[PDB]
Design goal:
Elements (H helix, E strand, L loop, with lengths): L1 H15 L1 H9 L3 H19 L4 H15 L5 H18 L10 H16 L13
Helix pairs in contact: 1-5, 1-6, 3-4, 3-6, 4-5
Length: 129
C-alpha cells in the first residue's frame, strides 16, 4: 500500500503545518477550497516537474471539492495525498525505496505553496488590526 504510506508521511507534515490548516479554514466555499488546491497544486507540480500540471492540480481540486467546505485539515490533506498518491502511483514515482517519505516531500511542496499564499496578502481573509 504505497498510497497509504505516502498519505501517512504527507498527513504527518500536513497535520504539523498550521499554515495548511489556516489555508483550509480561511476559505468558506468548496470552489475557493478547490481553487486554492489548484493554485498550490500547479506550484507543487511545476517544482516536481510534472508534464500535465493542470491535470494533477485538477485532481487536487476534485479531491478537496470531494469533501467540500467546513471540514478538518486531516480530511482535505488525506484527500490531496490520496489524489496526488494515485497520480504518483500511475507515474511509478511511488516505490518500495521510499514511497512513504515522498509523501513528506509532496507535503513540503504544498507547505511552501500555502506559505506562498501570504505573498498575495488578501486570500488569508485579510485584516488591519
Amino acid at each position: 500500500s504505497y498510497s497509504s504510506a505516502f498519505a501517512q508521511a504527507a498527513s504527518s507534515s500536513l497535520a504539523t503545518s498550521s499554515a495548511i490548516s489556516r489555508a483550509f479554514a480561511s476559505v468558506s466555499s468548496a470552489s475557493a477550497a478547490s481553487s486554492l488546491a489548484y493554485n498550490i497544486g500547479l506550484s507543487a507540480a511545476r517544482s516536481l516537474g510534472i508534464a500535465s500540471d493542470t491535470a494533477l492540480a485538477g485532481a487536487l481540486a476534485q479531491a478537496v471539492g470531494g469533501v467540500g467546505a467546513g471540514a478538518s485539515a486531516s480530511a482535505y490533506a488525506n484527500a490531496i495525498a490520496r489524489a496526488a498518491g494515485q497520480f504518483l502511483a500511475t507515474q511509478g514515482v511511488l516505490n518500495a525505496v521510499n514511497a512513504s517519505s515522498l509523501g513528506s516531500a509532496l507535503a513540503n511542496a504544498l507547505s511552501d505553496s500555502a506559505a506562498n499564499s501570504a505573498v498575495s496578502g488578501n486570500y488569508l481573509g485579510v485584516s488591519q488590526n
